[PDB]
Write a protein that binds this ligand. Structure first.
Ligand SMILES: CC(=O)c1cc(C(=O)Nc2cc(CO)cc(-c3cnn(C4CC4)c3)c2F)c2cc(OC(=O)N(C)C)ccn12
Length: 111
């Protein structure tokens, strides 16, 4: 029987992973707000990255009821990660920090 789910009904499912991401020591910091190309002086960002995503956007979507299915949220988390792996060199802090978050995402899912 078809139904719109309340944010709380999905919070139980999604919040454990989201909290694990936010908690990471310095590693979540480049992901806590949208990438701001003006501020950061990287005017090509949106040439490379067409669908930006960050943790504040994921949290807002959760809390407003925009995730109705977990696959939507998992898609979003991986979009954020793939955007970073795509734009940033393998050598960069942002890239390696992204990798740490991905590792944390997977471990939290599968202990
Ligand atoms: C996610 C992503 O792609 C991205 C994030 C940033 C970026 O600098 N985000 C950011 C935001 C905030 C808080 O507002 C903190 C940090 C940050 C990184 N390390 N730290 C610890 C010193 C305290 C904080 C951060 F990297 C960035 C910069 C970029 O520009 C750049 O690296 N240069 C050299 C121009 C390019 C991409 N990003």
């Amino acid at each position: 029987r078809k139904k719109i789910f309340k944010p709380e009904e999905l919070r139980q499912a999604l919040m454990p992973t989201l909290e694990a991401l936010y908690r990471q020591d310095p590693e979540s910091l480049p992901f806590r707000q949208p990438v701001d190309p003006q501020l950061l002086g990287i005017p090509d960002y949106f040439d490379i990255v067409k669908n930006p995503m960050d943790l504040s956007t994921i949290k807002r979507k959760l809390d407003t009821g925009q995730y109705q299915e977990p696959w939507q949220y998992v898609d979003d988390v991986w979009l954020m990660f793939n955007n970073a792996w795509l734009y940033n060199r393998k050598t960069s802090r942002v890239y390696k920090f992204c990798s740490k978050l991905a590792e944390v995402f997977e471990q939290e899912i599968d202990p």
